[PDB]
Structure formats: structure tokens, C-alpha cells
Scaffold this active site. Structure first.
Site, short mmCIF file in Angstrom:
data_model
loop_
_atom_site.label_atom_id
_atom_site.label_comp_id
_atom_site.label_asym_id
_atom_site.label_seq_id
_atom_site.Cartn_x
_atom_site.Cartn_y
_atom_site.Cartn_z
N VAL A 125 0.85 -1.19 0.00
CA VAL A 125 0.00 0.00 0.00
C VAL A 125 0.89 1.24 0.00
CG1 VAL A 125 -1.73 1.28 1.27
CG2 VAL A 125 -1.86 -1.21 1.15
N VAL B 28 1.27 5.52 -1.78
CA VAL B 28 0.91 6.62 -2.65
C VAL B 28 2.14 7.51 -2.80
CG1 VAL B 28 -0.50 8.69 -2.95
CG2 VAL B 28 -1.56 6.57 -2.06
N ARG C 77 -4.68 13.23 -1.24
CA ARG C 77 -5.72 13.58 -2.20
C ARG C 77 -6.81 12.52 -2.28
N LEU D 103 -5.51 6.69 -1.46
CA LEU D 103 -5.62 5.51 -0.60
C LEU D 103 -7.08 5.18 -0.32
CD1 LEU D 103 -4.68 3.21 1.03
CD2 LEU D 103 -4.39 4.67 3.03
N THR D 104 -7.86 6.19 0.06
CA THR D 104 -9.27 5.96 0.39
C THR D 104 -9.99 5.27 -0.76
OG1 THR D 104 -9.30 7.84 1.92
CG2 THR D 104 -11.43 7.07 1.08
N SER E 147 2.72 0.02 8.54
CA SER E 147 3.84 0.93 8.75
C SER E 147 3.53 1.94 9.85
CB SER E 147 4.15 1.67 7.45
OG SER E 147 3.03 2.46 7.08
N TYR F 73 -5.23 2.95 9.25
CA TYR F 73 -6.28 2.09 8.72
C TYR F 73 -7.58 2.08 9.52
CZ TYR F 73 -2.69 0.44 5.56
OH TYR F 73 -1.72 0.38 4.59
N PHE G 229 4.15 -9.92 5.48
CA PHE G 229 3.65 -9.59 4.14
C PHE G 229 3.26 -8.11 4.10
CE2 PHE G 229 0.01 -11.07 6.58
CZ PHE G 229 -0.93 -10.08 6.36
#
Ligand SMILES: CC(=O)CSCCNC(=O)CCNC(=O)[C@H](O)C(C)(C)COP(=O)(O)OP(=O)(O)OC[C@H]1O[C@@H](n2cnc3c(N)ncnc32)[C@H](O)[C@@H]1OP(=O)(O)O
Ligand SMILES: CC(=O)CSCCNC(=O)CCNC(=O)[C@H](O)C(C)(C)COP(=O)(O)OP(=O)(O)OC[C@H]1O[C@@H](n2cnc3c(N)ncnc32)[C@H](O)[C@@H]1OP(=O)(O)O
Ligand SMILES: CC(=O)CSCCNC(=O)CCNC(=O)[C@H](O)C(C)(C)COP(=O)(O)OP(=O)(O)OC[C@H]1O[C@@H](n2cnc3c(N)ncnc32)[C@H](O)[C@@H]1OP(=O)(O)O
Ligand SMILES: CC(=O)CSCCNC(=O)CCNC(=O)[C@H](O)C(C)(C)COP(=O)(O)OP(=O)(O)OC[C@H]1O[C@@H](n2cnc3c(N)ncnc32)[C@H](O)[C@@H]1OP(=O)(O)O
Ligand SMILES: [Cl-]
Ligand SMILES: [Cl-]
Ligand SMILES: [Cl-]
Ligand SMILES: [Cl-]
Ligand code: NA
Ligand code: NA
Ligand code: NA
Ligand code: NA
Ligand code: NA
Ligand code: NA
Ligand code: NA
Ligand code: NA
Ligand code: NA
Lengths: 409, 409, 408, 409
Positions: free
Chosen positions: C80, C82, C89, C92-93, C116, C121, C408
Site C-alpha cells: 500500500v 501513494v 488527495r 488511498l481511500t 507501517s 487504517y 507480508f
């Protein structure tokens, strides 16, 4: 399911050394293993093999060592001692030590010498710490020499390894008879000592060689060192890691040291493995500016007790009877009369009364003049049986030049 | 505008010591100044006074020191050497040294001894570093003794200073004839040595006293130490700062050390000012577990050269002619024949040929057996004039027990 | 910007390169190569600006052990990022909306990830459900209690190939008792045992240990790396342990003892252990094994009644949960959970609710690693019927804390 | 010879505590020793006296502890356990434990609890680590709360110790039935807990007290903390050392923490002794911003096994037969049937077949719900005798709120 045997061939040698590095938790150093093969005798490298791999190793190099007085005698330079973590504390080392000490005796070597990863390992086999080494280090700008130190009229050159190796061996051979503990260096040993190993590069830099020449052009001193560049908050902060400095006269020695100490950008110097009585310690104007950290270096195992005691010379006259107990090799136990001095030494069994009682490890500890027999007696490790015997024996076993560590093995 | 004079009265003594502490960048320690006054002779404390204050100081304590062989001889214990930052590098120290060395000579002391804040200060006046000390330290759980170390059947008690001082002086007097460099301790010196000073408390804790008794109740060992409590991420982490441990036999010495090493909550121990040949170094099973950092301790100034050389004993026979150059006091320069051994020593002017040429500072450096004359010759600081002379003289000037630092002054 | 999946192998390389770049690291070729073999390109989405990938989000098809031992499909969310040129902006959402819908349509009842930065989340319905322990200490201080039986087994240092012939069966037999562990295919084992260059730089080459019963049956294993070293008074090597497992208490203890007794070693470190790792209780002196605890796995419940019916409960429970799902409001509802050691059912109900909570906090308690009662005492969960939170908290617990799966 | 006895009078109490501090390598703390005397019972403080001084100590305070389910039961709070280094490893501790555990039994206390300097000391006497504690720490600017965390409408005041002690005890009393492991606090215990000890001041600053009031003026929360001022290279860097935060509802708890976290000049906060399930851990938006270091806190010694097991409540129903081996108190070894649940508990000797075999120390370890019986079985420390039995017993001995450390003793 284990077989005690020697290295059979070159592939077996690779497998053997690979297992040793693994026990030391290290990847095998290809460059070191290759250069050291050239002075390795496969029949001196024993170990245990389970059919699939080596699970234990113990070896020895045929070397020669300077004793107090200057005699150069054969010595077993014990090396590559490991037991796999899957087989440890089952007596494999103990068995390999029995085999090796018998082999050393049969080859006519009167003693064995080693460095110890952990010093307490070997006393149980008759080894005694006999030599210490000093890590000498300091800020170079605090290491001015006393005003009377003559640097002479010589010059220095930075040279290739090839050029270094054409002059350094003769310098080394001329100096080491005055430095008990140093060992002879064949070309093969010089190749190992001057190897620009990848491991040492990572901690500092590529190895460099210096030759000092007298005004008539005679090579009279040398240095091996590595630079470690660095910068601080207020200027340069490089460090010189000195491997070795020798000179055949006081001027070449002092001048070669001054060359290193006066190098630009350098602020720190460190000499690992120096003598605890290194001349440099007394050349400096301010004694404590050269920090000195002392640790164990060589352990001695006397294998042929009367022969070893007759092969060195003694700092003063001695006539003493030693009741020597050899716990690991009780066939060596005996009462030996030592008669010795600057110009002679003899030793043999006697039935006369014993003056001193001691174990063979402690006899080994005092053998190179680096540990005082009188201090061991004060500590209760050695027993005086006749008044005044330890006093005179301790002085005789001493020497006016402390023993020092040889190149490593 | 300066007057060279001695301390006149008690107020003048306070002002004098206050100026000394100020040059050392410290607030005057009232407790130390008070206890040390009791063995201070005001007429031995000189300095410069500008009418308003002291701008320089130099003093000496009348003490007695053990030489190699066991003789206890008077020595000037030089102390309180300072020059104010407003008057430095104008020769005031140099002038005070001329006056003091003349005064020492007139009092019948053959030598002077001092510790140096900066060792390079005193060589120019004829002092040579003669004794080194070792800071010994380690993790107590790594300091097991060799299996043969007998701890005996004695017991230990933690005692008051008063109880300690009733037994420790007799133990100390019995041991120090075997430890060249140690100094006699009057009750007044013991009071200073055992003072629970506020400065040392801040770095550790209150001073503690231990007595070791034989099974018959005879006091045979003692210890002075301070605890430094501490806790780590995984448990206790206290540290013991040992000031002194002595025993009259090997069992009391080993047992007293074992008492300290086995203390609960402790993980670290440090012994500052030990001997470079401290027995404890050889008692431990694993030599390098006891780290050893070596530095300068005592510098010796030979004031009456032939008398000093005749007052100690020599480790072996020697008959040598020394061409001694005394740069600071050239009236002492001369050619002296030294004849000595375990049982005798004499020294006087001779016209025979000189065997060795050396300065008085280097003669001082070798005088206690802590620096090898042969190494100084190899370093080029001493000159051999006749073959083989340095060999035998170096051994004779040595001793089987390294000199060690006295209680501080 | 185009929201799409990875289209081919070069596109895969470029996608992973952009992800590594956001993490401020050079792409690791060895890791990217091995992980490709369990990557499904259609599960790796992102945004592409025509010239390069500017955002990534992916999931692996894995399976996870739940309390009670059931092994169920889970989306193992990964990669994940960006780009810093397009951050904050909403990219992610958007990927989270797409991915969570995709996970639902694949029949996975939940998603799991490592974070991270854990605060990322929760806004999407994830809750920290599992913690991990870094266990470390001086090996000479880690003696076991005197009753700890080491048994009669033996140990051998083995190659990766020999290791992988025995370790998978040992692993498969142990993990039904360790909720949170994930199934490992040969491909996952190849990644887990990779002698990655980045881990070599920190310690040494990876080593493999097998423990055998006296009859020759492989019953334990260890993965570890040595880090040689020397101090001022002797050796000071460190062992960095990646995993130790045993099918019985003797093989577990003997394998640890093998590591702890290694010569030249003075320190050992086990990153990612359980907060209830058996080793913590084997040692004779509890605090000699230092324990640093942090977040591990976050759970996103995607099919709430299925997820709640798939695990088992440490004790009987019959409770009505008023669940609010801010990010996926189609999941909001009142659910009756009936469960216990030997059964679990969950369905929408009109009965009065007993507890009100968000989906992220339901996810936090779902693995038995966070107490529903503590969350209520903290004020994050509301009790509507006295006694309900106490009984539900115990039921959602489990006698073995959840632990972190392989990375992972 | 040694005498085992209790403290006789007040001077004897001073000497006893002084010896205890001395073994802990600390100067006696007069402030602590005087305040703690007020809840000491001299007849519960035993030790060994050699006629001249105390050489060992062991004591217990009469306290009460919250069990899972809220029952408050008498407990021996064991304290002041030392043996002088002159007398250690001769069984003096074991002899004091033998006496003390019999005394606790006779007083009708069903269990003992202690903190351990080194946890491995007490397992041999039947103690098991039953509660862990968390050091929670982090940068306050990283500790924002989740957006749904309601701070309510209360207000905070900094208050004197006196004002704090007029409200905090009632807040504490109302909260602790939900926090197993917490102990009752009399006025005398509060006086010790709020003591502005000179030891904690040196590490940080003077102790400060905060009260949280509801909108109607009711005191509903409190904090005890010490500031540690500091400045960095880029601005202020103060630290808050938190001793305790409690509230009677989630808003007063969160608001009191927020008040500390938002204090100006502060950058770091540290809370020692927190619960491993402290509510704060879940309030923060970024879980790992609150670092969490976990170690042993309280060990439990079950002295009256069937009574202790009947005094707590169980998280779910259980009916299990425990074969208990008590090594140090074999009079407790037996087979016990435990029947329990949220609303009942009974335990008594049975001849029914056993389900689980375990030692008393491990039964103590699981007794407060802080260690899983199932993990101990997986570790091999506990043996399952009937399949499935550990599963349900482990859940029952658990509890939805982790046990937590009481105030220090
Ligand atoms: C010449 C050179 O190569 C430089 S010296 C390097 C030695 N090698 C290493 O340090 C690598 C890592 N360590 C090892 O490989 C093994 O521990 C070594 C040191 C080779 C010993 O092999 P083992 O086969 O385990 O020795 P073993 O004969 O079983 O031991 C006999 C006694 O020696 C003791 N000992 C052996 N290695 C020890 C050690 N490292 N530390 C402390 N004690 C040790 C054993 O505890 C045993 O004592 P006891 O039970 O008789 O009281
Ligand atoms: C016996 C004891 O008390 C223990 S030894 C403590 C000595 N005192 C201190 O360290 C306190 C701070 N320092 C001082 O008070 C002064 O620097 C001391 C050390 C007392 C020297 O007083 P001065 O009056 O400045 O000495 P002075 O005779 O002028 O110096 C003669 C030579 O000695 C050198 N010298 C003196 N102190 C030195 C120093 N600290 N470092 C390096 N060189 C020094 C001077 O540079 C000069 O060398 P040259 O010009 O002849 O080449
Ligand atoms: C499954 C895995 O791969 C393991 S977790 C690795 C996550 N990736 C990384 O840490 C690499 C570095 N960071 C990034 O690439 C981006 O910051 C990530 C984390 C992907 C977010 O991408 P964005 O496109 O910037 O997120 P976006 O939807 O705009 O943010 C929605 C909300 O989430 C918050 N948020 C996002 N990332 C955050 C962060 N790192 N820290 C704090 N808050 C964060 C944003 O402030 C915003 O909150 P609000 O303004 O609505 O109050
Ligand atoms: C309730 C409180 O006060 C908090 S706990 C505070 C404990 N006290 C301290 O830490 C102060 C410093 N230490 C001491 O005073 C002593 O070491 C203590 C801990 C009181 C023990 O006194 P001793 O008289 O030496 O204990 P003793 O009964 O002889 O020992 C019985 C066993 O307990 C073991 N043991 C005792 N203290 C130990 C320790 N500190 N570390 C490791 N093992 C220890 C002894 O080795 C012995 O084992 P074994 O020989 O039976 O195999
Ligand atoms: Cl021996
Ligand atoms: Cl001179
Ligand atoms: Cl949510
Ligand atoms: Cl027990
Ligand atoms: Na020479
Ligand atoms: Na060397
Ligand atoms: Na003596
Ligand atoms: Na000393
Ligand atoms: Na299991
Ligand atoms: Na893990
Ligand atoms: Na509550
Ligand atoms: Na601020
Ligand atoms: Na607390």
C-alpha cells in the site's frame, strides 16, 4: 559415528575451513583461506567427520619462535580449533587435544603456542597464558616525543607490497632475536601478514606499506598500516590503524613512528597487539597520552619439559628443583633440576628435594618472562618449598625485554 | 612583587590550600583539607605570595617508602604544586622546584616521589615515571577463579572505620615490605585514606570497611570499597568501586576478593590504582574477563644518587659504571660505580670507564623495577657504552614484584 | 490517473519499483522475484499516470487460523503506497473502497495487514487485533526452570532444501493451536526462508536447524542468523532468531536451549514472537528475557456474520451487537451472536441490543488479543445491558493469545 | 551464634531497616523508614541477629487485595527480604521463608504477594509470577487520541498533597474492585505512596497532584506525577514521570491523561508500573506511539489453596480436578476439585480422577488471570491428564481485565 582424521585433499580442505568459519559465526573468507593454504600441512589438520561434514577441527602450523636469549626453536602454532554447536561439550576438543599434543611431541617440538578466543578454554590441557599484548592508542597531537629523541637523517617511502616484501623480511629477521615471542616469517607467512583482506578493509581502508631508509639508502625500518578517513564538527578526524612498525636502530624506529603521527588529516592512532613494553611508550613526552589496554596474547604448552627449559636462556643464574605436576599428561610429571643463566641452560630429572611445586600450565605461564613466578607464588598458585628459591627462580625466568605477540594464527 | 615563603599559621594554611584548589578548578574540600593538615608540616609548604594572596604553591610530606628488597627509607612526597593562571609560564614552578629539591637534600631524603596531573611536567626537573598502575574492572559474573584457588576457612565482617583502623594497620605493615612503592601509614595517613569524603560519595556511595579473620580469629585481610547501586533493563546492575584489598596470606586475599565478587545485586567491579601485576589478575579463570588499563603512577626524583642506589637491593648481581647526567641539578652529574645484588648495594664516584650513559630522570624511571633499562636503551633514551652491560644492569634494576602506587597524595 | 491492475511482468516490476521508492528503499530484486510466485496480478491495483505508477494497493490470497483452529480464507493486504506527488488527495481511500469490495466478492470474510503506521487504517474499519513481542536477552541469564524437560532429541544444522522437506509438516501440525498464523504454501516458504541480502547486511546468512526425536522423527525447527562480534573482555556475538517451533514441549525447549548454549554468543533476539511465547515462562528468571510489545495484525471484518460464525468462542455467549461501520455503512446492523467452544452462529436481529461498538473495535477483539471489557472501560465500546460486556469479552477471548504470521 | 527473632522496639526497628538498606547498597532513607513504620507490625518483621547487628531480614505487611470478581481479601505483602553478604548462601533466606509461610498460614491469610528484586529467588518457595506491568512511554506529540474519545466536560486542578488526600482515596476505593491486584490503601499507605521522597526528586522533580472534577463538582479522577525539566537543541524537552492516573468513568480518565499529554514544554511522558491492558494503550490513535515494555510485577504464593481458589470468581464455568504438588509446603499437596464461575466458587480435596497436574507456583501464576494455564501446558510446565480439561480451566482462571501491580512495597 564420528571419524577422527586429517584433511585428505583440497576439496576436503575447503570443507574443513568452511566448518571452522561457521563455528566462528562467519562466512568463509576466500582470500584468507587461499593464502593460508600455502603454509598449511594437511596432515597436521585433524578433526571429526560424521561422513557428511566436519563437526570438529584442530590444527597446527609448523613454525619457529624466538625464546629469551635469542634462540629460534620449532613450535607448534595451534590453530583452527572448533567443535560444531551440535556436538559441543561431549569431549571432542579434549580428545583432539590428546591426539595433537602426542603428535607435537613426536615431531620434536618442545612446546605449543596459541591465541585463545576465550582464555579459560586451554588451562585444563596444560596451557598457560605467557604473553600479554597492549592496544596502544591516542590523539596524535598529544604524542610528541621527548626532546632528546633523535630521529636521524633517514627518509620514508610509501611502497607497493612487492617492494615492501623485498626489504621488510631482512629487517624483521635482524630485529626479532631481541624480541622473545616473535616467530619466523617465511615468504608464505609474509603473504598472509600483508594480505589486503576484505574484512580489515571494511573497518578501515586498504593496507599500506612504508619503508624507512638510512641516508646511505639502506632499508632500516618499515610500517604496515591502514587509514580510516573521517571528519568531525571542527575539522578532519581520520584514524590510523597500525599493524606493525619495526626498525633496526632507535632512529629508524622513532622516525617511522613520527612519520605516522605527523600525517595530515589524522587525529587518532591505534596500534593493536603491541608489546606491553613497546619502545613507543617511553619515547612520548607525556606518558598517559598513549593509552594502554593490556590483555592476554599467547598461551604456552610445554610438551618436552626439560628440553624446553634448556632451550631458552635465563636473565640471571638459577639452580632450582621444580616438582612439576602435569594434570592432563601425567607422564610428564616429574622432579626437574633446572640450572641456567645468560650463557647456559640444562634440565633433567633429580631425586634431590624440590624447591618449588607448580603445575605445567603455570610453568608455561612463566616460561617467556611475561608472568612473574613470584607473583604466582604470592597468589598461592605456586608453592615455595625452600626459602628464597622463588625469588631467584622468578628473576631467572624473567627477561629484560617483555615477550610480545607474534603475527596472528 | 612576589615573596617566596612557607605557610605561617592556620589561616595562612587555609588560604594556601584554597588557592591550590582554585588552580585545580575545584571548590576547597573542607573535610580533606582538615584531615590532611594533621600530617602537614607548614615549613615544607612553600609558594609565592603577592601580599594579597597565594599565586603559587609547592609542598612535600615527610613519608617513608618501601624499596625493592624491603627497606623503608624516608622520601619527600611532593604535593600541592600549582601556579595561578595569572602567573603561569614565568618560571615560578621552576624556581619552586630548585628550592624544594635543595630542601629535600638537606633533610636527608635521598629521593622524591609524586603523582602528576600531567606527566610531561616533571621530566625537565629530573623526575622519571617509575611506577604504573592498572585500573582493573569487569563483570563480576565473568570473574570466577581457577579451580585450584584455595579460599581457606576464614570469615568476613563489615565493620566501622574505628574497628577497621584497629586491625588494618598491622595487616598493612606486614604486607608492604613485599610491595615496593607502598608507603608507611601513620594513624594520620590512615585517617585521610579512610575519610568518607563527600566528593567520592557523589560518584558512588559511603565508604565501607571489611575485615577478614582466620578461623582462629586473627585478622588477616581487609578491604575498602564503595557501592554504586543501579538497575538495568533486565535486573540489578550495581557496581563496586574497590579502593584497596590486602591479605597476609593467599587464602585471605582470595577470600576477601571472592566476598566482593559474589555480592548480590552487583554486576560490575572496578579497582583503580591496582598493581600491573596484581595477584587477582592471575587468580581469575578467564584472563581477559578482568580488563586492565595501564597508566603512569609515581615519578621518582633521585636527590642523593649514590645513597639511593645503595638503599635498595637488586634482583641479581651487578657491577656497572653509570655516567649520569643531571640536567636540572648539574652538581649531581658524575660517574658512579654501582655494585649490588640481593644481599648488598654500594655506589660511589669512580674514574673507571663508563658502561652506560643516562640522564637522572631515566635512572629514576628504572629505580623501582617498573621500567626496563634495556627497553630504554632499545628506544635510544639510554646509551650502552660497553657490550652486555645493559643486559645485566637491566635485570639487576628489575624486581620479581612490580612496584605499585601508594595511597594518593 | 487510471485505477487498474498489473497487466504483465514488466508492469509488475514497475509497480513494485514505485512501491519500494515510496518506502525510500531501492527495489530488492531477490524479494520481488520470490514474492511474484504467490502474487495474483488481478489483486494488485493502483493508480497510473500514463508514465508511471503513482499509487499501489494489493492483497495475497492466504488462509488464517482462527481461535478454535478453523483455517479460513483471508485477504493479506500488502504493498500500500501513494507517491509523495499525489499524497493526501484521497487515493488511498479510493483503493480501500475498491479493494474491500473486491475482497467481499471473493468470499473472504476478513482482511488482515501489518501497518507501517497503525493510525492509517482505523478510518477504513481496521482494528489492531494482534500484538507481537520482541524478546531478547543475555543468553547466560536465560537458564530454564529446573523442571523443564529437554527430552532425548538431537539437532542438526541443515540446508534450506533439507529444512523445507521437514519444516512444513511441523508447521502445519502446530499452527491450529496458534490463532493468527497463516498457511504456508511452498511459495510462501520460499519467501520466508529467502537469504535476503538486506537481512544479511544486518546480521549474517540465514541458517536452518532441525530437531529430531530419538526415533528420527523431525519434531522441531529453527530459522536464525548469526551476527558475530567481540567486546573488550571476550566474544559478544548475537543470534537473531526468525522462528522456533516444536510439536511437543521437549522439542521446543531443546531447540531453544541449542541456540542459547551456542559458543561465542552473548545476546539473542527474537523479533515477532508471541506476547505469550512459551519461552517467556520456561526461563528461570522472568525479566532476563526482555519483552517489548507493539502492534502486529489489524483485522477488517468484511462479512460480519460469517466471520463471527467461523471462529469458536472460549465460553458460551448469546449477545446482540449493534455494529456501526462508518466506512462501509452497508455492514451496519444489529447482529445476534450465539457461540461457544463447539458452535457459532450470527445473524441480523431486531431484539434489543446489549453492546454498541464500531466495526474497527469488533475487529480488534475478533482474534482474542484485545479485551472487549477493556475497550468498554476505555469508553470506546458502550454496554447497553449490564453483564453483557463481561460475558462477551470472555467469549471473544481465547486461552492462547493470537500471534503474528510471517511477514507480508 | 545467630538468633531468629522479631523487632523488639523502635531503636531495634531503626537498626533492622538500616541493615536492609545496606544490603540493597543504599543509604537508609529516613523519610521512607519513618512513614512506613506507621503500617509496620513489629511482630511480622523477622530476621537473624548475631548479637551485634542484624544480618538478615524478612517481613510482611497486613494488606488486602482485590481478586478477580471484586472480593477484597487479606494478603501478606512480603517485604524487606535481605541477607547480609557476610552470611549469604547459607540458607538464612530459606529459614526465614519456612518461618514466614507458617506464620502467614496461622494468621488466616490465604495468600502472599511480593515484588522481586530478582524473580528467580522465590519460585523455589512456591511463588509464581502472576502479574506483569508495563512501562508505557512516548513523545506526547505522537499520543493524540482516536477521534471518538470523549473527554467530557470536567475540569482539573493542581492541588496540595492535603487536598489530594481528601478526595483521591474515595476515587481509588470506587475504582479498584474492577482492577484485580490492586490493594486497599489506608491513610497510612496513602502517606507512603504520596511521599515526596528525596530519591525520586533527584531523578525528576517534586511530586505533584491533580484532581479531575465532574461538572457538578464531584471529584472523579486524579493524577500523581513528577516533572523533569529539560531543553534540547531545538526547543524544550521536558518529561513527565507519571506515578498513577485513575478515573471513575472513561471521560475523567481520558481528560486527566489529555491534561498531562498537552502540558506545555513537555515532549516525553513515562508511566511506570502501568497495566499491560492499560486503557490508555487503546485510546491513542497510533498504537505504537505508546511504547510498551513488559516485565514481571507481582508473584503470588497460595498458602491456603482451597480457600484462595474459593475466594476469587471465574470468567466462565469450570469443574476441574487439580493434582497440585507444593514443593516447599508439601502439607498443601493434594487433589482438589474446583467448581466455579462468575457467581460462585468452591474447592475441596477429592478422590475423583485428576484432570490437570501442576505445581503450586504455576497455580499461583495463573491465579490472578495474568498468565494462561493453556500456554503453561503448551510449555510443558503443566500436564493435561484428561483431554479438553485445560481449555475450560484456562478460560475460567482468566479474566477480562488483566491484573495490575499495586502500590510499591
Ligand atoms: C587455536 C584457535 O583456534 C584459537 S581458540 C578458538 C576455540 N574455538 C572457538 O572459540 C569457537 C567456538 N567454540 C567451540 O568451538 C568449542 O566450544 C571449543 C572451544 C572448541 C570446545 O569444544 P568442546 O568439544 O565443547 O570441548 P570439551 O572437550 O567438551 O570441554 C572440556 C572442558 O572444557 C570446558 N570448555 C570448553 N570450551 C569452553 C568455552 N568456550 N568456555 C568455557 N569452558 C569451556 C568444558 O566446559 C569442559 O569442562 P568440564 O565439563 O570438564 O568442567
Ligand atoms: C605534586 C602535585 O601537586 C601533583 S602534579 C599537579 C601540577 N599542577 C597542576 O596541574 C595545576 C594546573 N597547572 C599549574 O598550576 C602550572 O601549569 C604548573 C604545572 C604548576 C607549572 O607552573 P609554571 O609556573 O607555569 O611552570 P614553569 O616553571 O613556567 O615551566 C617550565 C617549563 O615546563 C613547562 N610546563 C609547565 N607546566 C606544564 C604543563 N601543565 N603542560 C606542559 N608543559 C608544562 C613550561 O612550558 C616550560 O617549558 P619551556 O618553556 O622551558 O620549554
Ligand atoms: C499493507 C501494507 O502495505 C503495510 S502499511 C504501509 C502504508 N504505506 C506507507 O507507509 C508508505 C508511505 N505513506 C503513503 O504511501 C501514504 O501516506 C498512504 C499511507 C498510502 C496514504 O495515502 P493517501 O493517498 O495520502 O491517503 P488518503 O486517502 O488521502 O488519507 C485519508 C485519511 O487518512 C489519513 N492518513 C493517511 N495516511 C496517513 C499517515 N501515514 N499518517 C497519518 N494519517 C494518515 C489522511 O490524513 C486522511 O485523513 P483526513 O484528512 O480525512 O482527516
Ligand atoms: C520482598 C522483597 O523484599 C523484594 S525481593 C528482595 C530480595 N533481596 C535482595 O535482593 C537483596 C540482595 N540479596 C540478598 O539479600 C540474598 O541474596 C537473598 C535474596 C535474601 C537470599 O538470601 P540467602 O540466605 O543467600 O538465600 P538461601 O536460602 O541461601 O538460597 C536458597 C536458594 O536460592 C537461591 N538464590 C537465593 N538468592 C538468589 C539470587 N539473588 N539470585 C539467584 N539465586 C538465588 C540460592 O542460590 C539457593 O539455591 P540452591 O543452592 O538451593 O540451588
Ligand atoms: Cl597443568
Ligand atoms: Cl634529567
Ligand atoms: Cl469503524
Ligand atoms: Cl512449587
Ligand atoms: Na633490537
Ligand atoms: Na603485533
Ligand atoms: Na607478601
Ligand atoms: Na592502589
Ligand atoms: Na500446540
Ligand atoms: Na513471528
Ligand atoms: Na471500572
Ligand atoms: Na510546548
Ligand atoms: Na502502578
Amino acid at each position: 559415528e564420528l571419524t577422527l582424521r586429517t584433511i585428505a585433499d583440497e576439496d576436503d580442505y575447503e570443507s574443513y575451513m568452511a566448518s571452522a568459519y561457521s563455528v566462528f559465526l562467519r562466512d568463509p573468507q576466500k582470500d584468507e583461506i587461499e593464502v593460508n593454504r600455502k603454509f598449511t600441512e594437511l596432515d597436521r589438520m585433524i578433526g571429526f567427520h560424521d561422513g557428511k561434514k566436519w563437526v570438529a577441527t584442530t590444527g597446527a602450523f609448523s613454525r619457529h619462535v624466538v625464546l629469551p636469549g635469542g634462540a629460534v626453536v620449532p613450535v607448534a602454532a595451534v590453530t583452527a580449533v572448533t567443535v560444531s554447536p551440535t556436538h559441543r561439550r561431549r569431549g571432542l576438543l579434549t580428545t583432539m587435544m590428546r591426539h595433537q599434543l602426542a603428535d607435537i611431541r613426536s615431531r620434536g617440538e618442545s612446546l605449543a603456542m596459541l591465541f585463545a578466543s576465550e582464555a579459560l578454554i586451554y588451562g585444563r590441557f596444560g596451557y598457560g597464558v605467557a604473553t600479554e599484548s597492549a592496544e596502544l592508542s591516542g590523539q596524535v597531537r598529544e604524542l610528541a616525543f621527548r626532546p632528546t629523541v633523535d630521529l636521524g637523517d633517514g627518509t620514508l617511502e610509501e611502497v607497493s607490497a612487492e617492494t615492501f616484501l623485498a626489504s621488510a623480511p631482512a629487517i624483521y629477521d635482524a630485529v626479532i632475536p631481541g624480541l622473545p615471542g616473535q616467530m619466523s616469517r617465511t615468504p608464505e607467512w609474509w603473504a598472509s601478514w600483508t594480505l589486503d583482506s576484505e574484512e580489515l578493509q571494511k573497518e578501515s581502508g586498504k593496507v599500506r606499506f612504508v619503508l624507512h631508509y638510512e641516508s646511505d639508502g639502506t632499508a632500516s625500518g618499515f610500517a604496515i598500516y591502514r587509514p580510516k578517513p573521517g571528519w568531525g564538527d571542527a575539522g578532519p578526524n581520520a584514524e590510523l590503524h597500525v599493524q606493525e612498525v619495526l626498525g633496526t636502530n632507535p632512529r629508524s624506529y622513532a622516525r617511522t613512528w613520527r612519520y605516522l603521527l605527523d600525517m595530515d588529516l589524522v587525529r587518532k592512532i591505534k596500534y593493536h597487539g603491541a608489546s606491553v613494553q613497546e619502545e613507543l611508550r617511553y619515547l612520548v613526552a607525556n606518558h598517559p597520552s598513549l593509552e594502554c589496554v593490556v590483555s592476554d596474547a599467547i598461551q604456552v604448552r610445554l610438551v618436552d619439559i626439560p628440553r624446553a627449559l634448556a632451550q631458552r636462556r635465563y636473565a640471571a643464574d638459577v639452580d632450582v628443583v621444580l616438582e612439576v605436576t602435569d594434570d592432563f599428561l601425567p607422564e610428564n610429571s616429574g622432579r626437574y633440576r633446572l640450572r641456567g643463566g645468560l650463557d647456559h641452560a640444562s634440565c633433567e630429572i633429580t631425586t634431590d628435594d624440590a624447591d618449588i611445586a607448580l603445575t605445567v600450565r603455570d610453568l608455561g605461564s612463566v616460561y617467556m618472562g611475561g608472568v612473574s613466578l613470584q607473583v604466582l607464588a604470592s597468589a598461592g598458585l605456586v608453592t615455595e618449598l625452600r626459602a628464597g628459591a622463588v625469588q631467584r627462580a622468578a628473576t631467572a625466568f624473567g627477561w629484560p625485554v617483555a615477550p610480545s605477540a607474534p603475527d596472528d594464527f
